[PDB]
From a paper:
We show that an opportunistic pathogen, Stenotrophomonas maltophilia, harbours a type IV secretion system (T4SS) that works as a weapon to kill competitor bacterial species. Heterologous expression of Smlt3024 in the periplasm of E. coli reduced growth rate, which could be counteracted by co-expression with its cognate immunity protein, Smlt3025. Results showed that Smlt3024 is toxic when directed to the periplasm of E. coli cells (pBRA-pelB-smlt3024) but not in the cytoplasm (pBRA-smlt3024), and that only Smlt302545-333, which is predicted by the SignalP 5.0 algorithm to be directed to the periplasm, could neutralize Smlt3024 toxicity. When a mixture of these proteins was analysed by SEC-MALS followed by SDS-PAGE, a new peak was observed containing both Smlt3024 and Smlt302586-333 with an estimated molecular mass calculated by MALS of 74.2 kDa, showing that a stable 1:1 complex (theoretical mass of 77 kDa) was formed between Smlt3024 and Smlt302586-333.
We successfully crystallized a soluble fragment of Smlt3025, corresponding to residues 86–333. Crystals belonged to space group R3, some of which diffracted to around 2 Å resolution. An analysis of Smlt3025 homologues using the Consurf algorithm identified conserved positions which, once mapped onto the Smlt3025 structure, cluster into the hydrophobic core of the central β-sheet and to the N-terminal β-hairpins. Interestingly, the crystal structure of Smlt3025 revealed a topology similar to the iron-regulated protein FrpD, the cognate binding partner of FrpC, an RTX protein of unknown function secreted by the type I secretion system (T1SS) of Neisseria meningitidis. However, the loops connecting the β-strands have significant differences, for example α2 and the β11-β12 hairpin in Smlt3025 are absent in FrpD. Previous NMR chemical shift perturbation studies identified the surface-exposed portions of the N-terminal β strands (preceding the central β sheet), the C-terminal portion of the last α helix and the unstructured C-terminal tail of FrpD as the probable binding site for FrpC. Although the corresponding surface of Smlt3025 has significantly different structural features at the N-terminus, due to a different relative orientation of its β1-β2 hairpin, the C-terminal α helices and the β3-β4 hairpins of the two proteins superpose well and the N-terminal β hairpins are amongst the most well conserved sequences in Smlt3025 homologues.
Numbering used by the authors: 86 to 293, 294A, 295 to 333
């Protein structure tokens, strides 16, 4: 309860901790982490926000309208208690197509949405890029056309670049999908602490997944592809929050 921001519509914004339930655990999260900067929205899970480049929360109340922070620096963080699926296999199930294709359908053989049909690329930023295998699309498009009378649609929005990081035993520990350079340009540029946008350009986006197996949490970040180089500091900032705020 140390720091104080504006008072708007009667509410004085502070960084005082707020009790947040995720499964059976209670996390005492400084209010200014929260998307609302007051209390969790109704529903399961919570949304936090951190700010590029130092992965610190928005100053208390600075996101409240009229905002005083720079919205282009925000990185929204959806944290969920995982109780509908196994947390230990979540990242492998997101990177395949068992859920979005029917058992034994032509679409279950789609190489685009299965990690085990994509092609590993050379490491960069500690990530293994995984690319679409156009040779497998030829075979797929044949059985798809012969069975529907139509060649399959190559919609660039659903042909994202994928990135994988792994633990020593091979388990997936990070999974990131980004708009391809064919779908979207970066739409912003960075030098130092500040990000200024390119108008008429839609910023390329990534979604970035990881889990906390011990707390049974999934974490989903949505951020501009221009921020991708700092993916590890983002994980580090969120895992520190999770570690520090959990009520022992
Ligand atoms: Br919230
Ligand atoms: Br609501
Ligand atoms: Br302020
Ligand atoms: Br779930
Ligand atoms: Br390599
Ligand atoms: Br997709
Ligand atoms: Br895995
Ligand atoms: Br993990
Ligand atoms: Br922007
Ligand atoms: Br998405
Ligand atoms: Br904290
Ligand atoms: Cl509280
Ligand atoms: Cl919950
Ligand atoms: Cl590899
Ligand atoms: Cl490995």
């Amino acid at each position: 309860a140390t720091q104080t921001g504006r008072t708007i519509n009667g509410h004085t914004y502070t960084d005082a901790p707020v009790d947040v339930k995720l499964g059976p655990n209670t996390f005492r999260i400084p209010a200014n982490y929260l998307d609302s900067q007051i209390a969790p929205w109704p529903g399961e899970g919570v949304t936090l926000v951190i700010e590029w480049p130092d992965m610190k929360p928005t100053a208390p109340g600075a996101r409240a309208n009229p905002r005083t922070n720079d919205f282009r620096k925000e990185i929204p963080i959806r944290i969920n208690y995982v109780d509908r699926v196994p947390v230990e296999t979540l990242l492998s199930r997101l990177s395949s197509n068992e859920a979005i294709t029917e058992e034994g359908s032509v679409e279950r053989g789609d190489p685009r949405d299965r990690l085990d049909q994509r092609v590993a690329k050379p490491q960069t930023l500690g990530l293994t890029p995984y690319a679409i295998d156009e040779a497998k699309m030829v075979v797929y498009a044949k059985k798809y056309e012969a069975r529907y009378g139509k060649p399959p649609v190559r919609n660039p929005a659903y042909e994202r670049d994928w990135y994988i990081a792994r633990q020593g035993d091979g388990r997936i520990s990070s999974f990131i999908k980004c708009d391809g350079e064919e779908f979207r340009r970066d739409g912003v540029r960075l030098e130092g602490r500040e990000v200024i946008s390119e108008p008429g350009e839609v910023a390329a986006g990534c979604v970035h997944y990881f889990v906390d197996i011990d707390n049974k949490l999934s974490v989903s970040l949505d951020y501009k592809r221009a921020f991708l180089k700092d993916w590890k500091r983002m994980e580090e900032a969120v895992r520190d929050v999770i570690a520090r705020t959990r009520s022992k």
